[PDB]
Design a protein around this ligand. Structure first.
Ligand SMILES: *[C@@H]1O[C@H](CO)[C@@H](O[C@@H]2O[C@H](CO)[C@@H](O[C@@H]3O[C@H](CO[C@@H]4O[C@H](CO[C@@H]5O[C@H](CO)[C@@H](O)[C@H](O)[C@@H]5O)[C@@H](O)[C@H](O)[C@@H]4O)[C@@H](O)[C@H](O)[C@@H]3O)[C@H](O)[C@H]2NC(C)=O)[C@H](O)[C@H]1NC(C)=O
Ligand SMILES: *[C@@H]1O[C@H](CO)[C@@H](O[C@@H]2O[C@H](CO)[C@@H](O[C@@H]3O[C@H](CO[C@@H]4O[C@H](CO)[C@@H](O)[C@H](O)[C@@H]4O)[C@@H](O)[C@H](O)[C@@H]3O)[C@H](O)[C@H]2NC(C)=O)[C@H](O)[C@H]1NC(C)=O
Ligand SMILES: *[C@H]1O[C@H](CO)[C@@H](O[C@@H]2O[C@H](CO)[C@@H](O[C@@H]3O[C@H](CO[C@@H]4O[C@H](CO)[C@@H](O)[C@H](O)[C@@H]4O)[C@@H](O)[C@H](O)[C@@H]3O)[C@H](O)[C@H]2NC(C)=O)[C@H](O)[C@H]1NC(C)=O
Ligand SMILES: OC[C@H]1O[C@H](O)[C@@H](O)[C@@H](O)[C@@H]1O
Lengths: 285, 638, 48, 215
């Protein structure tokens, strides 16, 4: 390729990390050459014209050029197996010259066009052997096979929804062409439904410091315990104050310790054991 | 009164080493310190290790490097740091990020034809840009956002480089394709790079459209002058004819100007086209209205041989009343009452690129002036009064050759530093702002501000370094009684790149047996370049241009032990598409966006200075910072 | 009200087990669309 | 071609021979090759402070700064080149002696002018720092500084720098033109009444080098 390349470098060091180097350009040129320009794709049997530009970048030396289009059974031009289609044009110094070439693709597939040219007196030359895709006569399209909903729980009752899928008829598909079928599975999830909890922003009093006797200590520990349990399952500690939770855990643990000072061998230790109080202790604990 | 403080990054990260600065003020002898981290809420013990002792030989400063494992919605998750200094325990809750690192996708070409193969590499690195071995999930979506291929390779022992390839079928939709990759440990964070698919053919020459000015003055009689430069890929000049047109853009909508269509010849590989102001105004139906909109040029060169054809386009030409723009995005929004406030004026051209050599000043003080450096930042400094009233500053460009009407102005508002209990104790950090380069040394100035009644109590400053979202370094700056200004010889290495912050604070007892903390932060920009170095030049230290098929030596100057991946592409390809490439500048742009700091420096109070710099302060006395529970920085509220 | 949050559903149950039997019938095909991933668009291509 | 034992030489010819007691003293290390031409990129430091460092610029001058005590005793400084690849034996050293600024009647009133020394270029602006040093008993008397500019042996300019009570550091936005070339000096002084109804004058001068190019 007669052009300017751009080299990109990337270093990956475990000491200096990643680093993208500045692009380095390399110009590759020649005093004389051919720029055979072929279209991306050419329709079979269709006669088209291809350009062949011959560049001459000599200081002050117009070149007597002899350009020839090599024969190829895949194409139909003036050049045959026993006949050479060669012109003899002249190119001014520091300029270019286009050379027309009529051809007709005969067989599909990646074919090959080749042109060569040499100058008289000067011992220079350059041939170009590029390849162009030869596509038949057709047009892109994406016919929709089918679009149905898949839900065994709803459609088809039973529990194992089945679905018959007809193939693509494509009655108008150009012979000798490929075609792919794509299956797409997509989940259509529908969330929602969760009645909000307490604002909490205006609920900063449940953090009561447990104190008192046996039952008085529980009444003060009740709000704090259930408060943390509620804020944990609602993750509302952000709007309430994260650095406030630590002050709550201490009050809960403090209430637990104070309640141990009233654990009979089984309110006041001097008093007979209560059935309800003991049962409630289990609930909170 | 032994004061045990602790400082950690404002936002912690998973599978990465985050530093943690331990301390102990007015402490005697040694002190066993035990750092522990638990999940929130409850207790699961993500990390119990990492314990150290604060020795009086180190001014009682600790250093514990920890790492938070994985062991995996919409609501952020937090962790509870717990530092126990012997018996006294101090804990603080910090936000956690699911981002494990960055991913960079590189494709050989920018545009591909149906039938060819796409060669793409995935670079896997951490927050420190250092290579890492992880599991990566790579997908490829079509123009209509539909995945077609998905891989699951690992950069394990691959040196953070994942070479891949995919063949594009002949039967496929053309347009914009996308390659999306993400770490297996963070599905929410996805990186993507686009490559266009189109039936094309590499041209033989490029076309450049450069307007004389990188903008357009509404009151410019001459009009928008545009130059059409066309040259072959091999450098040689191009002879042909070009078709140039104009138009106005509005957000996403474009309005072509049929009466601006020109057909100028292209001699010597150059062309000249002009868009008269007459036609421009006639394009609409209030010149001051077009202000803000943009103009786009669309050229189309055709050789005199009619063999090849190229279409170029320049878009984004701003229509403004002023050749400049001023931004206070690099200037702290908080000043110290009665102390020199530094203004980092950021002058830039209408396009976005920094403006070099453009004098600026303040509303008053006609005498005060300052030119803009190569980075686009000017150095200004003003004296403030001991007033607790907000300071309003208006900076005005003073570039000659123009008029007071063509100048661009901008106004900001700085707020006084709220001191603890109105004790009027401040701390200012003035930095000699010049283009810092890895290897030089920086003179960090520490200016104290407090009555002599307690000035003898201050004997040291605690400074910390922020870099890429991690604590680079932290030390102490000695101070003797009677010194208001002390310099800190801070050597700049290759780590400070790109930008590094510097927070400094001191703590003492005064006023009325009340603990007080005063801090000040500053953000400095270092020259943006590769952490190391990588150069690629011609091996042949002589000769001219090669010939197709000829060999050539290719010298590569990089760091030792480093692996280098190469790729060569015909420039003709970039003529069709030059977007979505990979540049070192684009890398730093991403790293900077992932910064946890959201303020050029300073803050409303001591708890604000740390938070606005990406840090969290917590002491045994009670002085802590503002709770942060939001990933992204403050929503840019203009 | 706290328990009301734990036993909360959110309206969902994407346990779909779709199977595909094309004439290529030389092996088998089975893709499962569970929650989390779910939306994940699984696709299959056949040149025939 | 010189035959010497150290590839470098140190000169304190660009460093003031007088320091302000208890104030940051600036050291302009002038490293040069054995021949005489300035040496580029050669780290230097002081006897102590192993951590302190500074590289040499293109002019052959390094930027050093040290903190002194309120002692009226002479300050001895030894600067040592710290260029790697060599040894402590191949390094060149030099020692100088700075004397404290004698204040009128021993009133301990000083004035320091610290300049951000970088290669000054006609068009830029210089931040002239004015650091005051005196008891608060008379600090409220100082309200302005009288600075003068020396250039090629003539007075280029002279003005006043305002100062409010309680300010130990004020900056002077001094714009550099094409006149300052090559080198320009800057003297600053203030006068007031204190101690015992005695007149006192305190001054401080500084010599800065501007880029050497055509006017
Ligand atoms: C030491 O002595 C120096 C010489 O006297 C002083 O230098 C002058 O200082 C000023 C301020 O820095 C210089 O800068 C400017 O001058 C220009 C204008 O051009 C000038 O015209 C002046 C005025 O003549 C008349 O003024 C009256 C009153 O307004 C008008 O009615 C009349 O129409 C006309 O304007 C001259 O006096 C003048 O100097 C220039 O010829 C002005 O635009 C700026 O605002 C500013 O004044 C000025 O050029 C200096 N003079 C020179 C260089 O010749 C210096 O102030 C003083 N200080 C020291 C120590 O340097
Ligand atoms: C399945 O079949 C459909 C139908 O052929 C294919 O859709 C076509 O595909 C291409 C690529 O997605 C679409 O190109 C886009 O065109 C849009 C819109 O058209 C525009 O219309 C407005 C208003 O009239 C104007 O801007 C123009 O007239 C323009 O034509 C354009 O905005 C985009 O730039 C883009 O190129 C095309 O729109 C679309 N044709 C339709 C829907 O009729 C589809 O590709 C194919 N593939 C599959 C499997 O879906
Ligand atoms: C918080 O702690 C960290 C970690 O300790 C400190 O950061 C700096 O870490 C480097 C580690 O490379 C230390 O310097 C290194 O020294 C090693 C040689 O190993 C050590 O040698 C010394 C001297 O005998 C011993 O004390 C050690 O036990 C060990 O043998 C060398 O190979 C490296 O190249 C490097 O020079 C350095 O000690 C330390 N810097 C200091 C002192 O501040 C640092 O204390 C602090 N860091 C932060 C983030 O604030
Ligand atoms: O004194 C100089 C200053 O004021 C005067 C103006 O003409 C300019 O020369 C400059 O802005």
């Amino acid at each position: 390729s007669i052009t300017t390349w751009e080299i990109l470098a990337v270093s990956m060091s475990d000491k200096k990390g990643i680093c993208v180097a500045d692009p380095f350009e390399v110009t590759v040129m020649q005093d004389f050459f051919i720029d055979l320009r072929l279209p991306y794709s050419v329709v079979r049997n269709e006669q088209v014209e291809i350009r062949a530009v011959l560049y001459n970048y000599r200081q002050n030396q117009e070149l007597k050029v002899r350009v020839e289009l090599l024969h190829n059974p895949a194409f139909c031009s003036l050049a045959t197996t026993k006949r050479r289609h060669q012109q003899t044009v002249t190119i001014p110094p520091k300029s270019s010259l286009s050379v027309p070439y009529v051809i007709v693709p005969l067989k599909t597939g990646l074919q090959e066009v080749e042109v060569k040219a040499a100058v008289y007196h000067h011992f220079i030359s350059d041939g170009v052997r590029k390849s162009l895709k030869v596509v038949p006569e057709g047009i892109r399209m994406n016919k929709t096979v089918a679009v149905r909903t898949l839900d065994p729980e709803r459609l088809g009752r039973e529990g194992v929804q089945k679905e018959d899928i007809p193939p693509a008829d494509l009655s108008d598909q150009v012979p000798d062409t490929e075609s792919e079928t794509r299956i797409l599975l997509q989940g259509t999830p529908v969330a929602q439904m969760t009645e909000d909890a307490v604002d909490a922003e205006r609920l900063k009093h449940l953090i009561v410091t447990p104190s008192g006797c046996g039952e008085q200590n529980m009444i003060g520990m009740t709000p704090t315990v259930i408060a943390v349990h509620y804020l944990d399952e609602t993750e509302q500690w952000e709007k309430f104050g994260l650095e406030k939770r630590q002050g709550a855990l201490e009050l809960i643990k403090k209430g637990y310790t104070q309640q141990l000072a009233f654990r009979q061998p089984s309110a006041f230790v001097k008093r007979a054991p209560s059935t309800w109080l003991t049962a409630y202790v289990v609930k909170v604990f | 009164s032994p004061m045990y403080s602790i400082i950690t990054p404002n936002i912690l990260r998973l599978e990465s080493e985050e530093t943690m600065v331990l301390e102990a003020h007015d402490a005697q002898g040694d002190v066993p310190v035990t750092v522990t981290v638990h999940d929130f809420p409850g207790k699961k013990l993500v990390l119990s290790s990492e314990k150290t002792v604060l020795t009086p030989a180190t001014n009682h400063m600790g250093n514990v490097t920890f790492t938070i494992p994985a062991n995996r919605k919409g609501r952020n998750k937090f962790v509870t740091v717990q530092a126990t200094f012997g018996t006294q325990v101090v804990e603080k809750v910090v936000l956690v990020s699911l981002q494990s690192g960055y991913l960079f996708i590189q494709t050989d070409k920018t545009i591909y034809t149906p039938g060819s193969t796409v060669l793409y590499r995935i670079f896997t690195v951490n927050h420190k840009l250092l290579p890492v071995g992880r599991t990566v999930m790579v997908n490829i979506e079509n123009p209509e956002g539909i995945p077609v291929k998905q891989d699951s390779l690992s950069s394990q022992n691959q040196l953070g480089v994942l070479p891949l390839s995919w063949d594009i079928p002949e039967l496929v939709n053309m347009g914009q394709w996308k390659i999306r990759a993400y770490y297996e440990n963070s599905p929410q964070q996805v990186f993507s790079t686009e490559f266009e698919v189109k039936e094309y053919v590499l041209p033989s020459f490029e076309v450049i459209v450069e307007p004389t000015e990188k903008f357009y003055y509404i009151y410019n009689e001459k009009g928008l002058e545009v130059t059409i430069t066309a040259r072959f890929l091999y450098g040689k000049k191009v002879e042909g004819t070009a078709f140039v047109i104009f138009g106005i853009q509005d957000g996403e909508q474009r309005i072509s100007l049929p009466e601006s269509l020109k057909r100028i010849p292209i001699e010597d590989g150059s062309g000249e086209v002009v868009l008269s102001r007459k036609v421009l105004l006639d394009g609409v139906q209030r010149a001051e209205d077009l202000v803000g909109k943009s103009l786009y040029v669309s050229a189309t060169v055709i050789l005199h041989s009619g063999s090849d054809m190229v279409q170029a386009e320049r878009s984004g030409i701003p229509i403004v009343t002023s050749p400049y723009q001023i931004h206070f995005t690099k200037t702290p929004k908080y000043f110290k009452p009665g102390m020199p406030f530094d203004l980092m004026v950021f002058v830039t051209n209408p396009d976005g690129s920094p403006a070099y050599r453009v004098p600026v000043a303040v509303q008053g003080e006609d005498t005060v002036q300052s030119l803009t450096q190569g980075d686009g930042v000017a150095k200004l400094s003003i004296n403030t009064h001991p007033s607790q009233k907000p300071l309003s500053i208006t900076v005005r460009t003073k570039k000659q050759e123009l008029s007071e009407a063509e100048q661009a102005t901008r106004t900001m508002q700085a707020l006084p530093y709220s001191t603890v209990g109105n004790s009027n104790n401040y701390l200012h950090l003035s930095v000699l702002r010049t283009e810092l380069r890895p290897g030089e040394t920086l003179n960090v100035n520490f200016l104290l501000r407090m009555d002599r009644a307690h000035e003898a109590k201050i004997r040291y400053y605690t400074y910390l370094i922020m870099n890429k979202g991690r604590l680079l370094k932290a030390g102490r700056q000695v101070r003797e009684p009677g010194q208001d200004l002390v310099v800190l010889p801070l050597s700049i290495t290759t780590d400070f790149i790109p930008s590094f912050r510097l927070v400094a604070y001191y703590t003492l007892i005064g006023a009325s047996g009340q603990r007080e903390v005063v801090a000040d932060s500053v953000w400095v920009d270092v020259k943006d370049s590769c952490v190391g170095s990588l150069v690629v030049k011609s091996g042949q230290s002589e000769d001219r241009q090669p010939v197709p098929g000829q060999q050539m030596t290719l010298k590569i100057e990089g760091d030792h032990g480093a692996r280098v991946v190469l790729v060569a592409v015909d420039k003709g390809v970039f003529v069709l598409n030059k977007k979505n490439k990979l540049t070192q500048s684009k890398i730093w742009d991403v790293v900077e966006k992932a910064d946890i700091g959201c303020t050029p420096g300073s803050g409303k109070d001591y708890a604000g200075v740390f938070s606005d710099a990406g840090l969290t302060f917590t002491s045994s006395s009670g002085q802590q910072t503002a709770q942060r529970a939001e990933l992204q920085c403050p929503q840019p509220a203009a | 009200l706290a328990q009301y949050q734990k036993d909360a559903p959110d309206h969902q149950e994407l346990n779909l087990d779709v199977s595909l039997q094309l004439p290529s019938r030389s092996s088998k095909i089975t893709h499962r669309i569970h929650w989390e991933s779910a939306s994940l668009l699984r696709s299959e291509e056949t040149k025939e």
